[PDB]
Amino acid sequence: NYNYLYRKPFERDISTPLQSYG
Amino acid sequence: CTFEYVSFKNLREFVFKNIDGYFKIYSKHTPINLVRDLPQGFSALEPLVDLPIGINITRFQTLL
Ligand SMILES: *[C@@H]1O[C@H](CO)[C@@H](O[C@@H]2O[C@H](CO)[C@@H](O)[C@H](O)[C@H]2NC(C)=O)[C@H](O)[C@H]1NC(C)=O
């Protein structure tokens, strides 16, 4: 499903590199 | 926009640090006599804010 994807403690990073889940 | 929040006779002091995705701000406000350097003496800063930002910081810039 193209709505869901993956690429320090509680760090987040929206920069870009991404694989969608099947 | 993944987070948002709202709330030379005087010396304003601050400390900023980012640890485990939390950004901590401390401060103190005090009167002073000589402005040319930081006043010799002691008074500890106390916490204001403790934001759950989750962001990496390596640079900063002041706003005038
Ligand atoms: C926080 O940001 C800095 C950049 O300002 C990141 O540092 C770079 O990380 C990459 C990782 O591939 C390296 O190739 C660069 O050489 C690094 N640059 C410098 C100037 O060190 C840093 O990795 C980030 N921190 C975290 C914990 O993600």
Q: Which residues pair with A19 in a beta bridge?
A: A6
B52 touches chain A (CB under 8 A): yes
| Nearest Cα residue to B47 out of B25, B30, B19, B64 | B25
Task: State this model's resolution in angstroms.
Answer: 3.1
Question: Which residue's entry shows tokens 């002691």?
Answer: B42
Distance CA B13, CA B38 (A): 10
Considering only CB atoms, which chain B residues are within 8 Å of A9?
A: 20-21
Task: Determine, for residues A8 and B55 on separate chains, whether the beta-carbon distance falls below 8 Å.
Answer: no
C-alpha distance from A7 to closest chain B C-alpha (Å): 17
Distance CA B15, CA B25 (A): 6
Preferred mutation among B17, B51, B56 to probe A, highest tally of A CBs within 10 A: B56
Distance CA B22, CA B24 (A): 6
How many angstroms separate the Cα of A13 from the Cα of each of A21, B5, B40? 18, 20, 42
Encoded amino acid at B34, one letter:
L
Q: How was this structure determined?
A: cryo-EM
**DSSP at B4:** -
Burial (Cβ within 10 Å: 0-12, 13-18, ≥19) of residue B23: middle
Distance CA B3, CA B16 (A): 18
